[PDB]
Design a protein around this ligand. Structure first.
Ligand code: 7RV
Ligand code: 7RV
Ligand code: 7RV
Ligand code: GDP
Ligand code: GDP
Ligand code: GDP
Ligand code: NAG
Ligand code: NAG
Ligand code: NAG
Ligand code: NAG
Ligand code: NAG
Ligand code: NAG
Ligand code: NA
Ligand code: ZN
Ligand code: ZN
Ligand code: ZN
Ligand code: ZN
Ligand code: ZN
Ligand code: ZN
Lengths: 554, 554, 554
């Protein structure tokens, strides 16, 4: 409880003194660090970004001389051509159609797009024409001497459908100027600025290169900066956007909050004639003449200038930086993942069999086998079916994970596992059964259902028994050695009774298993051959009992 | 320096050939990968998202026939009922109250909500009534034959408080159409589009299902799509929002930037009468009649249509993808964490004592003890108080981490630790003290303050001494074996002088400690019993000195 | 294939029972968890945040009494001083200059800022003055009896440049009220609310403390809340922002979506006179008098109130939470990184040599050497140049990684490595060459080009040969021991032919290498001295062949 809490687990590591792997690791670490730092700096991922709230105030300067037909020469000032800024847009009239002295009465509709009538059949009665802006009476009447148009109750004289005058009457509007004052705020960052600061000169007009910070814009300059023709757009009008981009850095050490001005036509050039190309609106001036209520309809074409203000303000935020660093921390395991993959791949035996002979250049990479055997310790799941057998004729060990369904273990033929290398430091001291192949194996006395477990020979092929080897007597059948091992485990062991024979048998089994399998993990589930088993059992006979044989440790 | 930099550390790993653990690991890896990929695809976390900047241009089409009372029949066209788009909203008049020929003079205020006066006391003088829109004079005068209302200096005839006409005069506005042109831009992504593209037909009107991309909307259709009644709203007016959502994907392979249109009433239906329900504004037309400056006040009720354009444009960004992948990489350790937790929990001994007998189904999970002992190597902090003792009668070892404050170590009673399994591969070769329990322990010759350190018996309970065992003489008291060990450590060691006895004593102590504790970590802080210690010391007596005893290695 | 997929790799770990390290680990884990949770809660990083779409509807209440000079006393109601909300801003007239009965004709320009003319030279002809708002004719004419100003074709009488009246005519506008209704929506979250809900009283007016949720604002209160003087601003006008911040939490358990009102002047106080200080616009009322088309120009100064609505709505999103948790997961490795760094640093030998004597307080930290030797297993890259040598006179081993370019290995002098501690548990059993220093080394029989490999002596300095040690005969030259090892490796080995001598030689080399280097990794690339090599080779002579010597295992 108390002790379990006060524990620290650290990973066991193998440190490789390799030039190539160290170089690869450092190259990858530096690459990851460089990319992560570059991304952090470029995208300012350490900054919290706040959108701006903007207020725009515009002022148009300019007077237009207009001459029309008696001959009437007049001047238009801001009140005569400008619609005050509403929201973030201002309108400049560039052309107009005037219809003076309109009365609500009957009149022929203007002949637009060949809207001629030859009979009263074509003209419906009671039909509200949104183009003509009147109610048809069902009659066709002469609009002039030659052509006739459907009659309508409307504001008369009706002139809707008349084309915009060409050239535009207020062409001189290209020479008008607009002063744009832009106040922006980031309330989360509690910062505010404006596009005009002390030091600027009113004698400036905006230029992309010479005066990119002057907020005074000539309208024609706006149009010609983005390849638009003010003279043409003036006839039918349009919508132009003045984009103000605020890429603002609010850190004291990198403070930069300046506006960037740009221009973009917002109305489609090739809008279909049916979809009301350009920009215009109809303005009515109502008055009384004699006893008649009249109105002067001005179809004003012009350019609506939409001032579009957008941008973000970035300020250092520790939480954003921490989240980014945490997001990128796992990328620093790239070197370990790559080098471990290299070690795993170049540890395979196949590489030596096929790859290396074909490509002798990659021969020095065989050292990865040593790294893998120093890094990885394979272990198999211990289950009752797990058995290990060893044949003296063969050089390797065999692992059997399959149940013995009556077939002798000698024939059940599991997979092959290598015998571990023995600790040389520790070794610096001094009617036979059909499945048998050595003439010493005896039939098992276990129950038939599990008799195949012990049906194992010391060798696969005929030959001399392992029991005949000199080492077998000393390692296994030497009573002195087994007694010494017993004393080592139990110094005060009493060498009396029938248990001493059982203990010697167990230690002899363990000794053979350790000798022929080395690994304790394999020795624990090893299976002794019948010959060696029975030689051990007769060296230490059991008096009045039946041998139980191998049992599952778990 | 140079070599230390060229190093790679790799973790030591134990590979388990387990079907269940491999299956669990792969299931968890696939689950994590699937969720991470699904989140990335669904939220487009590989995309950087930019808000759009929008421009809206509206055009209302329609004519309304209005008949009022002589009987006056007229028609309203766009100039008579429409307020041009300003910002992103347009207004359509649906009802109106007209007050013609107003003069700044004295008049009785309109009797609204029973605003009657019976005496001059109720009518204050100089009071500016924002409802009546005039200055009270303090007098109560007859507004008509029967009822009287307070006098005010105001625009007269004053009609403020008159209810909106019912039914609405411009009901036919439900049949008006609005064409909405929406230009949107993502400047960061340098992309722009509009809601009208070549191919569309003007003969379309919007429908949620049939024509969801037609930008021509009948106002009544707008109202009835969201269960609003245009006829009723027309009387007092309201505010309707046309929402244009641009969920735009700007990747070439998944390009989809189309508008979705929706409608939402923006004015509260149940606004209190005191809070100005609906939508109206007062418009003044000033003129001169005779020598008098007059004005026609139109209280125009109608629907303000707010065009609300919102959305984001997503474009693939490598940094966003990298940050997301880094954020999600640590989730791939889930399999390892879960399997390690399983191994730790099922390695506990308790599971066998209580859990397994109750639930025999979870018995095969005992293999986790083997995995844990193959994965974890416990070690304790080496401190001067750390001691290990072993009693031949007992089967385990005892660890004492507490200072001996004069109490004999035999009685100080630390915790219990298991004795490690000996390497069987290496073992394949050939007036007694009160605290004593074997009759061979002698009083310690160390200073009293630290005499309790050596006050240890080979056993807890009375019995035969471990020294009497045969193995004790060979392992510990055999001069030949100790000399051989000395030669192994120091091949050219000179067996002369008084140092040879000290070296043999040290090696005998080490041999006993290794034999009775196995582990070198426990043997280093082991404590020899007094009996064995003094038997060793008399086998190799010290000539002219005092034994120093156990010392702290660190 | 099938088996390789069903594998789980778990890291080998050493568990340290340390109070300090466990405490540090838990402190760091708790610190990381606390900061991560605090950041998640404070920034709502579990929430997805959506910007709001807003609609604003304003209503101004108030009447202003204005007296001017005959003496004219009038009242202004909303239609006389208010511009209806367009976009999200409303204008209140606070001052005005009136120019009645303007005709397009010739007139002298108003004498503003001393715009006097003394000769026709100063007055250009055809010059469009945007300040005077007329076309100069090139003549200088008397504007009055004393001063003269340039003639212009313009709307006359021209009064542009006249200063705003002081005090402001519509001062009483400070007492006007505005009701602001704000509808906001988060469409992604499908949530909508408004700033007015049932329960509020119309008899409220906004106050920062008493009535912070009342949407009725007195204009003078707006100005005086942020230290602005309405009386002064009324003369020339200005722009004020009413900021409505919606910090909205849309989770059911933490639902809070309320508006916060604030005020900010948006027009620069100290705008240069040339940059049009304040806020005004010119409004033209056109009419016909007699047979002349005239206009009344009102330069209306006032306050434009910009209603600025901003905010975000946060709603729990599982993906955002998952991404944040993944981003922060890697920070939980801080404890491991720090403790491992501590172990690595305090494991260095230098600490004992210099740091500990200077600062004895940090002496108990020497236990980190044990932790490091229990955590890390150094291994070097096995390459053909890798050799290990051991000198009996010296106590350590020497590693040589450099090619022998004809120089004897005895003199090539590589680095020093410690000899590993032998397993005491396993040890519990029973004309001389110029480079030589023992009198037993013989010249190598290998080819000259690689003769320096075997040119190694058992010791660096003159002395007795290691071969003379008793252990050398038993470990190396004992035929019985080598035969026993052969049987252990190959139980049925046939001790016949010339191969038995070669096998005994190989095992003798291995035995010496294991004895003098312990570690199998160092023993594999160890180099035997010439004396021991040739003693072994003469104990087991080769009959009719040439010894091949050491070979690279890989
Ligand atoms: O009437 C004419 N121009 C005024 C316009 N608006 C009217 C509405 N104002 C306004 C201002 C503030 C708030 C609300 C509203 C702004 C200005 C017409 C609509 O489009 C922009 C200009 C106009 C057109 C074409 C030929 N003539 C004349 S009048 C004239 C007569 C004689 C000589 C010169 C001009
Ligand atoms: O005056 C009337 N309607 C015009 C309205 N606005 C005026 C201002 N215009 C405008 C345009 C551009 C820039 C700046 C301003 C837009 C249009 C009145 C305000 O609300 C919307 C319509 C009106 C109402 C009710 C009965 N009659 C009549 S006039 C009439 C007379 C005889 C026959 C029919 C209509
Ligand atoms: O004309 C005067 N005030 C009306 C203002 N606007 C006009 C345009 N309307 C409007 C409404 C809806 C849509 C489109 C447009 C709003 C109101 C003038 C521009 O600035 C705001 C007020 C004005 C000024 C200064 C002295 N007098 C008088 S008229 C008057 C005459 C006698 C007595 C009192 C006032
Ligand atoms: N590894 C291994 N152990 C065995 C084998 N046969 C018996 N044993 C061990 O010996 C013990 C059984 O004792 P045994 O000598 O067969 O007869 P017993 O006196 O009736 O118990 C068990 O604990 C087994 O682990 C074998 O073939 N291989
Ligand atoms: N593990 C262990 N080592 C001991 C013990 N007693 C003595 N030693 C070791 O023996 C050395 C002291 O020598 P010692 O034989 O007691 O007498 P000395 O000749 O005066 O040094 C120290 O290095 C101890 O590590 C013991 O009880 N346990
Ligand atoms: N570690 C080590 N191994 C050696 C050395 N000399 C020979 N060997 C081993 O002995 C084998 C060569 O056999 P050797 O006795 O020299 O003569 P051979 O009969 O011709 O092969 C090789 O596999 C070497 O690994 C040495 O100096 N050090
Ligand atoms: C703009 O000004 C220049 C220089 O005064 C003049 O040449 C040009 O004609 C003007 N443009 C128009 C459309 O009047
Ligand atoms: C602009 O359009 C006008 C037509 O109004 C044309 O006369 C002129 O040549 C055009 N200018 C350019 C640069 O294309
Ligand atoms: C709308 O149009 C239909 C069909 O022309 C007509 O029946 C209906 O009366 C109209 N609505 C109004 C309010 O006039
Ligand atoms: C809409 O309101 C009008 C009242 O102006 C009513 O006559 C009509 O029945 C209503 N329509 C519906 C569908 O509720
Ligand atoms: C505002 O109202 C108060 C109280 O009615 C009055 O004293 C003050 O003069 C008013 N302000 C103006 C500018 O008329
Ligand atoms: C506000 O300005 C006026 C000038 O119009 C001045 O008389 C008054 O004292 C000022 N008020 C304050 C509080 O400064
Ligand atoms: Na991570
Ligand atoms: Zn056999
Ligand atoms: Zn056999
Ligand atoms: Zn005793
Ligand atoms: Zn004893
Ligand atoms: Zn020599
Ligand atoms: Zn020698």
């Amino acid at each position: 409880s108390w002790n379990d809490v006060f524990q620290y687990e650290t990973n066991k590591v193998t440190r490789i003194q390799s030039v190539n792997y160290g170089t690869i690791k450092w190259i990858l670490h530096m690459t990851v660090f460089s990319y992560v730092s570059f991304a952090l700096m470029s995208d300012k991922l350490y900054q919290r970004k706040e959108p701006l709230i903007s207020s725009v105030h515009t002022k148009v300067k300019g007077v237009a001389e207009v001459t029309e037909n008696k001959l009437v020469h007049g001047i238009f000032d801001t009140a005569d051509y400008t619609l005050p800024l509403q929201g973030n847009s201002f309108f400049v009239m560039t052309n107009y159609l005037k219809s003076e002295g309109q009365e609500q009465k009957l009149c022929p509709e203007y002949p637009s797009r060949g809207k001629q009538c030859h009979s009263d059949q074509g003209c419906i009665k009671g039909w509200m024409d949104p183009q003509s802006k009147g109610i048809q009476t069902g009659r066709c009447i002469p609009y002039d001497q030659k052509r006739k148009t459907c009659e309508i109750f409307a504001w008369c004289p009706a002139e809707e459908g008349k084309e915009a005058p060409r050239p535009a009457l207020l062409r001189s509007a290209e020479n008008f100027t607009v002063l744009i004052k832009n106040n922006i705020d980031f309330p989360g960052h509690n910062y505010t600025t404006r596009n005009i600061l002390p030091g600027m000169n009113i004698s400036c007009t905006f230029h992309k290169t010479w005066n990119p910070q002057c907020p005074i814009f000539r309208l024609g300059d706006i149009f010609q900066e983005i390849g638009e023709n003010f003279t043409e757009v003036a006839v039918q009008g349009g919508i132009m956007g003045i984009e103000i981009y605020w890429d603002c850095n609010l850190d004291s050490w990198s403070h930069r909050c300046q506006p960037k001005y740009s221009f973009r036509r917002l109305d489609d050039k090739y809008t279909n004639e049916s979809l009301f190309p350009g920009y215009n609106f109809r303005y009515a001036k109502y008055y009384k003449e004699n006893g008649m209520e009249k109105r002067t309809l001005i179809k004003a074409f012009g350019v609506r200038f939409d001032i579009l203000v957008f941008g973000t303000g970035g300020k250092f935020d520790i939480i954003q930086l921490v989240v980014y660093i945490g997001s990128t921390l796992s990328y620093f395991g790239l070197a370990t993942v790559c080098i471990d993959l290299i070690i795993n791949t170049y540890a395979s035996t196949c590489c030596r069999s096929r790859v290396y002979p074909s490509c002798k250049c990659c021969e020095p990479c065989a050292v990865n086998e040593y790294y893998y055997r120093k890094k990885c310790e394979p272990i198999v799941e211990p289950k009752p079916t797990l058995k290990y057998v060893s044949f003296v004729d063969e050089p390797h060990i065999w692992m059997v994970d399959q149940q013995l369904l009556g077939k002798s273990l000698q024939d059940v033929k599991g997979q092959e596992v290598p015998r571990p290398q023995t600790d040389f430091l520790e070794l610096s001291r001094l009617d036979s059964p059909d499945w048998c192949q050595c003439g010493n194996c005896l039939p098992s006395q276990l129950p038939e259902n599990r008799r195949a477990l012990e049906e194992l020979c010391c060798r696969r092929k005929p030959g001399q028994c392992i029991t005949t080897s000199e080492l077998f007597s000393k390692i296994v059948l030497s009573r002195e050695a087994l007694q010494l091992l017993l004393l080592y485990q139990e110094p005060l062991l009493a060498l009396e009774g029938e248990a001493i024979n059982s203990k010697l048998r167990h230690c002899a089994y363990r000794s053979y298993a350790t000798w022929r399998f080395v690994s304790q993990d394999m020795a624990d589930f090893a299976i002794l051959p019948s010959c060696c088993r029975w030689k051990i059992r007769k060296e230490f006979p059991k008096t009045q009992g039946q041998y139980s044989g191998f049992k599952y440790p778990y």
